[PDB]
Amino acid sequence: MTKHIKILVIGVGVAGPAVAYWLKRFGFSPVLIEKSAAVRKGGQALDIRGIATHIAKEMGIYDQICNMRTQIKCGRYVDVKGNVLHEEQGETFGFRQDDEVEILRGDLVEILMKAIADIPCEFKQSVIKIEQNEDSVTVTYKDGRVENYDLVIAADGIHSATRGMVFSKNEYQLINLGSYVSAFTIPNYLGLDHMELLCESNHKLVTLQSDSQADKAMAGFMFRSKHVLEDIRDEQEQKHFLHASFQNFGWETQNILNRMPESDDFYFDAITQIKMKSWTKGRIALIGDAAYCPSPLSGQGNNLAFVGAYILAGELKKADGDYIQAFTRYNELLHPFVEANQQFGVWVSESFLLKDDEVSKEIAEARSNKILAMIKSVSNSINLPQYE
Numbered sequence: 398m399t400k401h402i403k404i405l406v407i408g409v410g411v412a413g414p415a416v417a418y419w420l421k422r423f424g425f426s427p428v429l430i431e432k433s434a435a436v437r438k439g440g441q442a443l444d445i446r447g448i449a450t451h452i453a454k455e456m457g458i459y460d461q462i463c464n465m466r467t468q469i470k471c472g473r474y475v476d477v478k479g480n481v482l483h484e485e486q487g488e489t490f491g492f493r494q495d496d497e498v499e500i501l502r503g504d505l506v507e508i509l510m511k512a513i514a515d516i517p518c519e520f521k522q523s524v525i526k527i528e529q530n531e532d533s534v535t536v537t538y539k540d541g542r543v544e545n546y547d548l549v550i551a552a553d554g555i556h557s558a559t560r561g562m563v564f565s566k567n568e569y570q571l572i573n574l575g576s577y578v579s580a581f582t583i584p585n586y587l588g589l590d591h592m593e594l595l596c597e598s599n600h601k602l603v604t605l606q607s608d609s610q611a612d613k614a615m616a617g618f619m620f621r622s623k624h625v626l627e628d629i630r631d632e633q634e635q636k637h638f639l640h641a642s643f644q645n646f647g648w649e650t651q652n653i654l655n656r657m658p659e660s661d662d663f664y665f666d667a668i669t670q671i672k673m674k675s676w677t678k679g680r681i682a683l684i685g686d687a688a689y690c691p692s693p694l695s696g697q698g699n700n701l702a703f704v705g706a707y708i709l710a711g712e713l714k715k716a717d718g719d720y721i722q723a724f725t726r727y728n729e730l731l732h733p734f735v736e737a738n739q740q741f742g743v744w745v746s747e748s749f750l751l752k753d754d755e756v757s758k759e760i761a762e763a764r765s766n767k768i769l770a771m772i773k774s775v776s777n778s779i780n781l782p783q784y785e
């Protein structure tokens with residue numbers, strides 16, 4: 398029966414715990430593994446918008462998520478001289494409305510994990526080899542130990558090890574949107590109070606905010622550049638590149654970068670999308686960022702994770718565990734919605750920053766209203782199946 402189907406879920410992020418929840422709810426018995434020692438605190442702020450809110454509510458975690466929501470009261474577009482060009486309330490500023498809500502990743506994962514306390518999960522575990530035939534998937538762990546599963550569902554992030562292990566270069570594209578993103582936490586030297594400031598130029602923008610930690614501020618950088626690092630993983634090269642890339646930006650960049658060396662949660666990566674004709678191969682399926690990351694410019698990453706988790710578990714349910722039928726349904730039903738939200742992210746990468754002109758209240762406001770409407774449109778551009 399479905400209960401006795403062995404399913405390995407790799408990655409305790411959003412998609413992994415999400416798909417584990419729905420699989421369990423739909424009569425299956427999944428198990429989770431995680432490379433990290435434990436759930437990482439805080440981190441990037443995730444949007445739960447569109448249909449993802451409906452899924453969250455059915456999961457019985459929506460009120461919990463709201464209890465832990467970000468509490469930015471005010472967002473401001475400012476020029477390099479610190480003048481306020483355009484101001485908006487927090488939710489509107491983040492292009493959210495209605496029941497939509499923003500929550501830090503770590504907080505959301507903790508909530509997700511509490512919702513699946515009955516599901517076996519093993520941290521500090523890593524898969525080093527995967528092999529499958531028609532009957533089974535053989536998983537080799539770090540210590541050389543081996544186990545067999547009927548199915549493996551990998552939710553191990555945009556830099557998916559599993560994707561590289563299972564798929565060839567012809568079976569997926571890493572789509573570069575010609576821009577970089579960086580973020581780190583610093584002392585709230587400005588004394589921001591549940592407020593975010595955003596300053597921008599023709600190719601770059603810098604954000605600075607404080608929210609749930611009063612004596613801390615989260616700095617953000619987004620910019621376009623065709624430059625390539627000799628080693629994109631080299632944190633020292635990242636900080637040198639970022640500093641040199643913003644040396645003449647003005648505004649608070651000097652004050653922010655002066656505090657960068659002492660920040661301990663530094664993050665830097667290219668803005669990238671994962672494009673796959675098929676998210677699956679035999680008994681293995683990718684999900685979440687590993688399968689179809691829409692990049693931070695889309696704001697749809699979380700949305701796609703929840704929807705993917707719901708549909709995949711659903712189609713497996715309807716197929717009574719027949720993964721071949723389910724995986725096909727998984728690819729067909731979900732791709733257009735993924736592609737829609739990915740194209741939105743691409744659009745943001747190409748037209749959010751003013752090409753020629755300097756920002757003003759009129760532009761900031763019109764652009765804000767336009768993005769709010771458009772994101773609402775794409776985030777709801779799928780008709781969610783009812784598996785129950």
Ligand SMILES: Cc1cc2nc3c(=O)[nH]c(=O)nc-3n(C[C@H](O)[C@H](O)[C@H](O)COP(=O)(O)OP(=O)(O)OC[C@H]3O[C@@H](n4cnc5c(N)ncnc54)[C@H](O)[C@@H]3O)c2cc1C
Nearest residue numbers: 408409410411412432444553554558685686693696698699
């Ligand atoms: C700077 C930034 C800002 C963002 N902003 C937004 C936003 O505003 N709105 C939005 O909707 N989305 C945003 N996103 C995207 C969003 O964070 C993700 O799409 C979402 O968390 C879903 O990710 P996931 O669960 O598929 O994988 P992840 O959240 O990356 O989790 C993967 C998990 O698997 C683990 N793992 C990794 N490799 C392995 C391995 N080999 N073996 C075992 N475990 C492994 C990781 O430690 C992690 O816990 C942003 C992303 C970034 C980087």
